[PDB]
Design a protein around this ligand. Structure first.
Ligand code: 90C
Length: 222
């Protein structure tokens, strides 16, 4: 077991809770408030998590911003997916917040979440392990295709470090399947697809607020 995967496991943020309001009756407005409140608390720990990724904090501050601005929804969704593996037709946003099909219909999220459930179903059949989760998550941040990177070279380096770490691990604990790392990489499109659609929905129903995401990430990064 190599040191990248080992440190990435160590850098996992702790459990966040959504704390839905037991007073408020379940409605479509409730769901968004809960998910909004939970996402904001996750975003704070997601930026701490990034800084422990080897080489991330050596990037320029604009490149740190560009990676997080490109990948934040992918990172949120991957977490939901991983927590959902041992459940059935349900998305585990938090240990205290689980959304089944009817609550997704009510939240206006049915199509999004059915796609997120394809991703869950797919990691189930490959028996996805925590070490692959945290490595795929790190790859998703680094492979996020930002429009404006200052140092293309350093960013490709971080890609290739995390890429090699994934290949390394799979060569290690998965000899039964010499193509498992390639299969892992091939689930990255579905994750970009649902995140692309989720971010678009984020903006359709105007959840961005007043402060643009790039200054929020600048504040959190300092
Ligand atoms: C005002 C500004 C500071 N922001 C920052 C971020 N913020 C936000 C970010 C992400 C969502 C996500 C849902 C669920 C996606 C589908 O399952 C979502 C709901 C509606 C539209 C798009 C996404 C979501 C995903 C994973 C997860 O662990 C938790 C939350 C919701 C809100 C609102 C507040």
């Amino acid at each position: 077991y190599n040191k990248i995967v080992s440190h990435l496991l160590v850098a996992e943020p702790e459990k966040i809770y959504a704390m839905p309001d037991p007073t408020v009756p379940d409605s479509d407005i409730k769901a968004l408030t809960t998910l909004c409140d939970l996402a904001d608390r996750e975003l704070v720990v997601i930026i701490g998590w990034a800084k422990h990724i080897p080489g991330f904090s050596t990037l320029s501050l604009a490149d740190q911003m560009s990676l997080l601005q490109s990948a934040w929804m992918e990172i949120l969704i991957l977490g939901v997916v991983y927590r959902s593996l041992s459940f059935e037709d349900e998305l585990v946003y938090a240990d205290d917040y689980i959304m089944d099909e009817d609550q997704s219909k009510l939240a206006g999220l049915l199509d999004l979440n059915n796609a997120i459930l394809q991703l869950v179903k797919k990691y189930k059949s490959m028996k996805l392990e925590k070490e692959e989760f945290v490595t795929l998550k790190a790859i998703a941040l680094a492979n996020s295709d930002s429009m404006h990177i200052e140092d293309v070279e350093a960013v490709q380096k971080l890609q290739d470090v995390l890429h090699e770490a994934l290949q390394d691990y799979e060569a290690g604990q998965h000899m039964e399947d010499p193509r498992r790392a390639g299969k892992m990489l091939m689930t990255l499109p579905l994750l970009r697809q649902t995140s692309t659609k989720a971010v678009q929905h984020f903006y359709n129903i105007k959840l961005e607020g007043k402060v643009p995401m790039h200054k929020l990430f600048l504040e959190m990064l300092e």
